[PDB]
């Protein structure tokens, strides 16, 4: 058996490549107390333990936009993943990891060094996140539009192996939507500033935010009635009602000008990415558009994606937005299949070859 | 002659367009007696009148953290401003108001209602406080850090085109420092607990407090000698001496961890706001930092702001802090220029425009 | 005298006939503000004015790659060229326009009516950019390596007349290299994505990029020794270093397989274009190869073009890569010579003929 550790910007998933669901799924946050201890606790809390006690902690995300910003912090989460959640020694089983495309070379290079020195894994492999998503859907030719907390990358794949020259990466994802939500949540008088209050907003986004089919008519509908207002209960017990902000936050995916970014929306980015491929391939990619990541879990995003892409694409040819119900763990599931696939077993970067080359051998 | 009334958390300034200084400045407080009357005056005292008789009244601030928490008291201050301080009729001249950025949508919405049904002002405009501060300096580019009594915010402006996505607001201002000063004043034995005694603490803050250039070095100096101790006289004749608290209360601005707040310091907030801005306009923002508000009048805050940003900012960049001596009324002085501008006469919200549509016209 | 206006993709050059250097050289960008204005407003900024305030603008090039996107934006730049940069009115004197090689007449017909109706110029002449490049070089025969910011044209003209069949177009220009540079700049951790940051990458390309004579040999040197690393200073004061990106972006011209293009490099396209002409003049074309355009200013490109073409060409042929230092402005410089001719009055397209 081989571990499949898919470290994500917000949430990291670890499994055993012999299951269809990750064994341990916890937020990738490490919190440290911001007050002194008069009750004569551990120095820092990692994962879901920090979430429960997030009131007295300053939550810090070791990953920002798919780049490990705090390597000392990340050396703890992996220690917490192997020894506390999975409870399996890495020294006996190989470890699979996923990295976002168009990442700095130093990000993946330092990943190889830590696992082969600190944890001494027998073998390691870094796979593109989007490629793993396609294998989870049982397809070999499709443009994977993956969106998470830091990376929203559309990687077109044609008979596998992907197309490196047509990979588009956009830095607008769930974390930006969370930050945008609190900026517009002050409109109604609710102030969420601290890191602990941010996680409350994330729960609001996950349970009440949805993508509107048409932004213009939905704005008028919400401004003329109150049928779109929903009440959410804070942990303190106060009841807050959000109206037009339910679909204003997810609309930032398609109109990044709300955040003041010149980058095109995810609907146009996918359209642009397909145009970079060959003419013959563009027929297959459009009909096999596969979403993934937790960001694409909004109710009605798939239907909205179909309408937007159809207008941009030629009318003579069809659009098919595939939205599997398990797309939240699509990246890990493909890694589970790949690690159990016979072909990938020859791609294990063994320890002995690592010492003769160094961490730079991972780039291939 | 357009009226320019700038309501603040601590003090509200009223005057006339075309002038250089506010005509009438008084604290924004409404106080009422608590002890039962014996000898046969008024139900409520507003303004400097409350200051004279603060020993008997219960002083309440109608504005807290830039949000009007009591519209009953707020109407009295405006009524007292027009008919007692300026002694003018609002029915014949427009009124220019200022509001803090990222305020609740219902805050100024009630502001439009009051001036359009209770005072029947011919026109009224609402402008951001930070935008007006740049008018007074005569500049057209710079990150305006407006640290008022209730709200501290940094709104970068480049060639007039503001950047809303780079606006950072902090709920840490002079009032919080006043509450923190009396918290640490109990260390030496001085106990100020009543709201009347708060004004005594505020007077102490405005006279003896200052910002230390090197907090760590100054703390050791104050504990090794008695050169920094200063003597202040209470209204009842008592003489008190304060030592290291002179530079400890203003130090909370740069280290909000003293107050238990997770937000960054004023130096980090200014630097973080610039980082949100684009790379090309960063150069014109480092050399044009503008300070405003009463809180930014501590002796030596400009030098401290220069040093703290220099470490964070690239060494190649030349940082120049602009600290005009009249920065207390920078919001009003800039507001006076706006009301006198010929091109500004077209942006007044007319009475016809309001009643035909409603308060929805504001927030444009 | 006449106005030598070169509406080239990217850098546009304007000046007076009979002069040596263009008077005004400003970018062909029509920028518009994206963030709203709270205080004062010039709804559109064009040229050098837009570059100064490029931080808060969305820089859109009216010319994609030879294919003019917005014909309304083109009139804005031409309006900026005459009234603002040159401060002259085309009413008194005729204007001269430069034309990209092998373009549909639909592009020309729209160009004709704009000068004749919007600006009312007394006369105008449309000329091929590639032909004028050799004119500034002093020879009327040879092959021109027209490689600008948009589209690379290989036009082996003869007696001052371009051969329509021998023209080969390669979609590998400075803009595509600029996109490729930031695509590979993300390897070291530098992320330029917005349109404003694109101009920053271009300045890095013009100052740090160079063509390596041997690609494989330089890879070993770059990895073994960091001597090739050089430091550049960002407008915000940050300093960045590029080790192998200096000669990996210009190398895309010779190996388009880096960017996924099945077409061959400029060196192979140059060799292919020569064979399309008749054999009797092939020896003349091999000797006279004149490079042009700002793309071909990477140092050592003449040596690389000399080495690559020599291997492709037969040993009997002699290769001489003529690389004038003024190749960027050769299109403009040649136009000044053509307009200054006393015989240029005959083929003027006057107002009567319009």
């Amino acid at each position: 058996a081989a571990l499949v550790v898919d470290n994500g910007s917000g949430m990291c998933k670890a499994g055993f490549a012999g299951d269809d669901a990750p064994r341990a799924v916890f937020p990738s946050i490490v919190g440290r107390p911001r007050h002194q201890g008069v009750m004569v606790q551990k120095d820092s809390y990692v994962g879901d333990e920090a979430q429960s006690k997030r009131g007295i902690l300053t939550l810090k995300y070791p990953i920002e936009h798919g780049i490990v910003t705090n390597w000392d912090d990340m050396e703890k989460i992996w220690h917490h993943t192997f020894y506390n959640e999975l409870r399996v020694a890495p020294e006996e089983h190989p470890v699979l990891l996923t990295e976002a495309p168009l990442n700095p070379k130093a990000n993946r290079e330092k990943m190889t060094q830590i696992m082969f020195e600190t944890f001494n894994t027998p073998a390691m492999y870094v796979a593109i996140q989007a490629v793993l998503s396609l294998y989870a859907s049982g397809r070999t030719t499709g443009i994977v539009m993956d969106s998470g907390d830091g990376v929203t990358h559309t990687v077109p794949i044609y008979e596998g192996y992907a197309l490196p020259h047509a990979i588009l990466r956009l830095d607008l994802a769930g974390r930006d939507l969370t930050d945008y939500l609190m900026k517009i949540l002050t409109e109604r008088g609710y102030s969420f500033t601290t890191t602990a209050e941010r996680e409350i907003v994330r729960d609001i986004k996950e349970k009440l935010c949805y993508v509107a089919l048409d932004f213009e008519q939905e704005m008028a509908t919400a401004a003329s009635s109150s049928s779109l207002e929903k009440s959410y209960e804070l942990p303190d017990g106060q009841v807050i009602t959000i109206g037009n902000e339910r679909f204003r936050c997810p609309e930032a995916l398609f109109q990044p000008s709300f955040l003041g970014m010149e980058s095109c929306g995810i609907h146009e980015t996918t359209f642009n990415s397909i145009m970079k491929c060959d003419v013959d391939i563009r027929k297959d990619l459009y009909a096999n558009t596969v979403l993934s990541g937790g960001t694409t879990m909004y109710p009605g995003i798939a239907d909205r994606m179909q309408k937007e892409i159809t207008a941009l694409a030629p009318s003579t040819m069809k659009i098919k937005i595939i939205a599997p119900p398990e797309r939240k763990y699509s990246v890990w599931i493909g890694g589970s299949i790949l690690a159990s696939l016979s072909t990938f077993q020859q791609m294990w970067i063994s320890k002995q070859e690592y010492d003769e080359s160094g961490p730079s051998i991972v780039h291939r | 002659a357009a009226l320019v009334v700038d309501n603040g958390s601590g003090m509200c300034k009223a005057g006339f367009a075309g002038d250089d200084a506010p005509r009438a400045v008084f604290p924004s407080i409404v106080g009422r007696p608590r002890h039962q009357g014996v000898m046969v005056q008024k139900d409520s005292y507003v303004g400097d009148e409350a200051q004279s008789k603060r020993g008997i009244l219960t002083l309440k601030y109608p504005i807290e953290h830039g949000i009007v928490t009591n519209w009953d008291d707020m109407e009295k201050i405006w009524h007292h401003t027009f008919y007692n301080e300026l002694r003018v009729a609002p029915e014949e001249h427009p009124v220019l108001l200022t509001e803090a950025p990222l305020n609740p949508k219902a805050n100024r919405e009630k502001m439009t209602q009051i001036m359009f049904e209770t005072f029947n002002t011919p026109a009224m405009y609402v402008a951001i406080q930070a935008v007006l501060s740049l008018y007074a300096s005569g500049r057209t580019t710079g990150i305006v850090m407006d640290s008022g009594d209730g709200v501290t915010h940094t709104v970068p402006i480049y060639e007039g085109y503001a950047l809303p996505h780079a606006i950072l607001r902090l709920d840490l201002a002079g009032r919080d420092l006043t509450d923190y000063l009396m918290k640490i004043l109990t260390e030496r034995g001085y106990s100020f607990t009543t709201t009347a005694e708060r004004e005594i603490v505020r007077d102490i803050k405005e006279k003896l407090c200052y910002v230390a250039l090197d907090f760590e070095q100054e703390m050791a100096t104050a504990a090794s000698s008695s050169s920094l101790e200063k003597s202040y006289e209470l209204p009842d004749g008592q003489v008190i001496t304060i030592g290291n608290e002179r530079f400890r209360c203003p130090e909370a601005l740069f280290q909000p961890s003293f107050l238990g707040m997770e937000s960054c310091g004023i130096h980090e907030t200014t630097f973080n706001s610039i980082m949100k801005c684009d790379v090309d306009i960063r150069k014109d923002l480092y050399a044009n930092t503008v300070l405003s508000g009463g809180t930014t009048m501590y002796p030596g805050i400009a030098d401290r702001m220069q040093k703290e940003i220099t470490a964070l900012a690239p060494s190649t960049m030349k940082i120049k802090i602009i600290a005009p001596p009249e920065r207390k009324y920078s919001v009003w002085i800039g507001g006076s220029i706006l009301a006198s501008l010929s091109t500004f006469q077209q942006m007044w919200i007319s009475k016809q425009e309001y009643d035909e549509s409603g308060p929805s016209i504001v927030h444009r | 005298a006449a106005l030598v206006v070169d509406n080239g993709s990217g850098m546009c050059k304007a000046g007076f006939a009979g002069d040596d250097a263009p008077r005004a050289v400003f970018p062909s960008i029509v920028g518009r503000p994206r963030h709203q204005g709270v205080m004062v407003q010039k709804d559109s900024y064009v040229g050098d004015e837009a570059q100064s305030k490029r931080g808060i603008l969305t820089l859109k090039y009216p010319i994609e790659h030879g294919i003019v996107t917005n014909w309304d934006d083109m009139e804005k730049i031409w309006h900026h060229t005459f009234y603002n940069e040159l401060r002259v009115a085309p009413e008194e004197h005729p204007v001269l326009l430069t034309e990209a090689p092998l373009n549909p007449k639909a592009n020309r017909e729209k160009m004709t009516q704009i000068m004749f109706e919007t600006f009312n110029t007394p006369a105008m002449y449309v000329a091929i950019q590639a032909v004028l490049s050799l004119y500034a070089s002093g020879r009327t025969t040879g092959i021109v390596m027209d490689s600008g910011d948009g589209v690379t044209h290989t036009v082996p003209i003869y007696e001052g007349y371009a051969l329509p069949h021998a023209i080969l177009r390669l979609d590998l220009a400075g803009r595509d290299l600029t996109d490729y540079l930031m695509k590979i700049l993300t390897e070291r951790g530098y992320s330029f994505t917005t349109t404003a940051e694109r101009e920053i990458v271009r300045d890095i390309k013009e100052k740090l990029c160079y063509v390596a004579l041997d690609f494989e040999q330089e890879m070993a040197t770059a990895a073994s020794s960091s001597s090739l690393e050089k430091s550049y200073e960002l407008p915000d004061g940050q300093v960045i270093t590029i080790g192998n990106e200096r000669f990996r972006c210009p190398e895309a011209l010779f190996q388009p397989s880096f960017l996924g293009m099945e077409s061959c490099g400029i060196h192979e396209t140059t060799f292919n274009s020569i064979m399309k002409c008749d054999v009797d003049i092939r020896k003349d074309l091999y000797a006279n190869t004149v490079l042009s355009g700002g793309t071909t200013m990477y140092p050592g490109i003449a040596d690389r073009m000399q080495k690559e073409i020599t291997a492709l060409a037969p040993s009997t042929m002699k290769i001489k890569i003529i690389a004038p230092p003024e190749r960027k402005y050769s299109v403009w410089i040649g136009g000044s010579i053509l307009a200054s001719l006393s015989t240029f009055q005959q083929m003027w397209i006057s107002k009567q003929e319009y």
Partner: peptide, 7 residues
């Protein structure tokens, strides 16, 4: 990141 963005 190093140049561009924060990371």
């Amino acid at each position: 990141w190093x140049a561009x963005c924060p990371a």
